[PDB]
Structure 1
Amino acid sequence: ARVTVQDAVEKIGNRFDLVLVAARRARQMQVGGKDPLVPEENDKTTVIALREIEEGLINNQILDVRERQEQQEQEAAEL
C-alpha cells in the first residue's frame, strides 16, 4: 500500500497493468463519488485503490462487471 506495492503486483500480474487499473478505481473515488470498500484510514485515493487491489477486492473484470451492470439499470429507468 503505502511503503511498498510489491504485494499488489501479483494480484494483477504486471507493473504496467497495476497503474492502469488503480488509476481507474481512484478516479471513481475522486470525481465519481463512489464509496471505498476498505477503511479509509485518512488516506488519499491513490493509496486506497492500491489497498483495495492487494486485498483482492478490485480486479480488471470487477471494474468492468460493475460498470457494465450500472449502465443496464440506467438503460432501464430511461426506457
Structure 2
Amino acid sequence: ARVTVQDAVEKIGNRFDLVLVAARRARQMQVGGKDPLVPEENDKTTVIALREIEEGLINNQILDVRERQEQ
C-alpha cells in the first residue's frame, strides 16, 4: 500500500533526499545481499526501501553509521 511519500517527507522534510536514500537502499537490497528490515509481502525492492524509510528507522544518519560499523 505504498502510493504516497507524504510521511516519507514528514521524516525527511526534503522530498529530494528521499530519492537518494531510497536509491542507496534499493541498490543494497536488490543486487547486494541486504535483507528487508520490514515484513515483505511481494513488494518490489524500491517499495521495500520506501517502507523502511517511512517508519523513522532508516535515514542518512542510521544507514551511514551502519556502513561505518561495517567498514
TM-score category by the smaller chain? 0.7 to 0.9
Structure 1 residue 32, shift from structure 2 partner = 1.1
Aligned length: 70
Shift of 1:41: 1.0
- Give the aligned partner of residue 30 of structure 1: 30
Cα shift readout 1:25-67 (whole Å, capped 9, x = no counterpart):
1111011111110011100011111011111120101111010
- Paired residue secondary structure (1:8): helix
Two-structure CA RMSD over aligned residues (Å):
2.4
Gaps of 5+ in 2: none
- Find the residue that maps to 1:38 and give its secondary structure: coil
SS in 1 for 2:6: coil
Task: Identify, as 1 or 2, the structure richer in helix.
Answer: 1
Q: In structure 2, what is the equivalent of residue 39 of structure 1? A: 39
| TM-score, normalised with respect to structure 2 | 0.88
Q: What TM-score do you get using the length of structure 1 for normalisation? A: 0.80
> How far apart are the structure 1 equivalents of 2:32 and 2:57?
18
Q: How far is 1:12 from its partner?
A: 1.4
Aligned-pair identity (%) = 99
Partner Cα separation in structure 2 for residue 33 and residue 57 of structure 1: 19
Instruction: Provide the C-alpha distance between the structure 2 equivalents of 1:33 and 1:12, rounded to a whole number of angstroms.
Output: 26
**Which whole-Å CA distance do the structure 2 matches of 1:41 and 1:11 have between them?**
24
